[PDB]
Amino acid sequence: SMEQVAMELRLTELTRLLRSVLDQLQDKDPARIFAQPVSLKEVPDYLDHIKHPMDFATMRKRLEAQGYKNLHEFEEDFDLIIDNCMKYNARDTVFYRAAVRLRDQGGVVLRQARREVDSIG
């Protein structure tokens, strides 16, 4: 149906806007602390601590499959990245600190992304 195509075009254009958002957020992580999944070979206890691991590569795979239906879903995954790290790592660590800085800087980007998604529909 044409209605199904039109919905698919809207998902495509959301995907485009979320790719730009993802790029901008990842630039706020110049150390690449959040680029890849935590390795269970190197942190074998991780899944005892953190139930839903997340990282930028995993988000990018979901994005390229058009797997985010709305901005809320994408924000949920970004928040997991930050929140997971702030639980596993202590306040005095480079990891925790990196997460705080990513959260603070990413807020700016997400605030305007929300206006854009609402505005364009």
mmCIF file of C-alpha atoms in Angstrom, residues 14-104:
data_model
loop_
_atom_site.group_PDB
_atom_site.id
_atom_site.type_symbol
_atom_site.label_atom_id
_atom_site.label_comp_id
_atom_site.label_asym_id
_atom_site.label_seq_id
_atom_site.Cartn_x
_atom_site.Cartn_y
_atom_site.Cartn_z
ATOM 1 C CA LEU A 14 13.986 9.570 11.246
ATOM 2 C CA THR A 15 16.897 7.187 10.715
ATOM 3 C CA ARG A 16 18.772 9.916 8.845
ATOM 4 C CA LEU A 17 18.207 12.437 11.626
ATOM 5 C CA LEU A 18 19.215 9.832 14.337
ATOM 6 C CA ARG A 19 22.418 9.049 12.434
ATOM 7 C CA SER A 20 23.394 12.735 12.596
ATOM 8 C CA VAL A 21 22.424 12.809 16.327
ATOM 9 C CA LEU A 22 24.520 9.641 16.957
ATOM 10 C CA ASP A 23 27.496 11.267 15.266
ATOM 11 C CA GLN A 24 27.269 14.366 17.272
ATOM 12 C CA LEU A 25 26.943 12.413 20.572
ATOM 13 C CA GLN A 26 29.847 10.183 19.758
ATOM 14 C CA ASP A 27 32.036 13.240 19.116
ATOM 15 C CA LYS A 28 31.517 14.066 22.785
ATOM 16 C CA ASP A 29 33.454 10.856 23.609
ATOM 17 C CA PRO A 30 36.804 11.599 22.128
ATOM 18 C CA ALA A 31 38.529 8.972 24.295
ATOM 19 C CA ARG A 32 36.286 6.319 22.666
ATOM 20 C CA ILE A 33 35.355 4.940 26.105
ATOM 21 C CA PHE A 34 31.795 4.133 24.912
ATOM 22 C CA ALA A 35 32.594 3.056 21.313
ATOM 23 C CA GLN A 36 32.414 -0.712 21.777
ATOM 24 C CA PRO A 37 30.731 -3.255 24.088
ATOM 25 C CA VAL A 38 32.375 -3.989 27.360
ATOM 26 C CA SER A 39 34.368 -7.203 26.741
ATOM 27 C CA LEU A 40 33.206 -10.202 28.865
ATOM 28 C CA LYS A 41 36.655 -11.688 28.300
ATOM 29 C CA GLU A 42 38.224 -8.633 30.069
ATOM 30 C CA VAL A 43 35.355 -7.927 32.612
ATOM 31 C CA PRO A 44 34.017 -11.471 33.162
ATOM 32 C CA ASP A 45 31.669 -10.371 35.996
ATOM 33 C CA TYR A 46 30.026 -7.568 33.964
ATOM 34 C CA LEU A 47 26.659 -9.163 33.400
ATOM 35 C CA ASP A 48 26.259 -9.837 37.131
ATOM 36 C CA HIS A 49 26.317 -6.071 37.537
ATOM 37 C CA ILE A 50 24.774 -4.657 34.373
ATOM 38 C CA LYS A 51 21.684 -6.297 32.914
ATOM 39 C CA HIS A 52 21.340 -4.362 29.642
ATOM 40 C CA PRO A 53 24.846 -3.424 28.272
ATOM 41 C CA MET A 54 24.915 -0.740 25.632
ATOM 42 C CA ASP A 55 27.580 1.041 23.511
ATOM 43 C CA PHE A 56 27.772 3.211 20.383
ATOM 44 C CA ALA A 57 28.567 0.329 18.003
ATOM 45 C CA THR A 58 25.581 -1.638 19.171
ATOM 46 C CA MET A 59 23.384 1.513 18.693
ATOM 47 C CA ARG A 60 24.763 2.030 15.190
ATOM 48 C CA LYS A 61 23.832 -1.578 14.195
ATOM 49 C CA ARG A 62 20.276 -1.055 15.462
ATOM 50 C CA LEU A 63 20.092 2.322 13.673
ATOM 51 C CA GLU A 64 21.229 0.921 10.309
ATOM 52 C CA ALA A 65 18.555 -1.769 10.523
ATOM 53 C CA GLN A 66 16.022 1.108 11.075
ATOM 54 C CA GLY A 67 15.447 -0.370 14.457
ATOM 55 C CA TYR A 68 14.580 2.899 16.302
ATOM 56 C CA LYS A 69 10.844 3.734 15.715
ATOM 57 C CA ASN A 70 10.982 7.036 17.602
ATOM 58 C CA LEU A 71 13.492 9.314 19.434
ATOM 59 C CA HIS A 72 12.453 7.916 22.844
ATOM 60 C CA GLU A 73 13.819 4.495 21.890
ATOM 61 C CA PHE A 74 17.133 5.976 20.771
ATOM 62 C CA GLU A 75 17.416 8.074 23.966
ATOM 63 C CA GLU A 76 16.743 4.989 26.069
ATOM 64 C CA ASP A 77 19.830 3.248 24.539
ATOM 65 C CA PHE A 78 21.973 6.410 24.979
ATOM 66 C CA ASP A 79 20.929 6.661 28.622
ATOM 67 C CA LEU A 80 21.930 2.985 29.144
ATOM 68 C CA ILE A 81 25.433 3.783 27.984
ATOM 69 C CA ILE A 82 25.761 6.569 30.587
ATOM 70 C CA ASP A 83 23.838 4.945 33.385
ATOM 71 C CA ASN A 84 25.537 1.531 33.120
ATOM 72 C CA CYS A 85 28.971 3.204 33.398
ATOM 73 C CA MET A 86 27.920 5.399 36.361
ATOM 74 C CA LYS A 87 26.863 2.240 38.229
ATOM 75 C CA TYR A 88 29.787 -0.085 37.474
ATOM 76 C CA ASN A 89 32.507 2.519 37.900
ATOM 77 C CA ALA A 90 33.177 4.689 40.934
ATOM 78 C CA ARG A 91 32.944 8.474 41.046
ATOM 79 C CA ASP A 92 36.738 8.936 41.112
ATOM 80 C CA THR A 93 37.369 7.085 37.827
ATOM 81 C CA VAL A 94 38.061 8.300 34.336
ATOM 82 C CA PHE A 95 35.154 6.090 33.150
ATOM 83 C CA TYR A 96 32.514 7.672 35.417
ATOM 84 C CA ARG A 97 33.813 11.131 34.674
ATOM 85 C CA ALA A 98 33.639 10.477 30.944
ATOM 86 C CA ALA A 99 30.025 9.426 31.305
ATOM 87 C CA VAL A 100 29.084 12.578 33.190
ATOM 88 C CA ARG A 101 30.694 14.751 30.485
ATOM 89 C CA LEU A 102 28.919 12.777 27.727
ATOM 90 C CA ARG A 103 25.602 13.126 29.498
ATOM 91 C CA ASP A 104 26.011 16.891 29.967
#
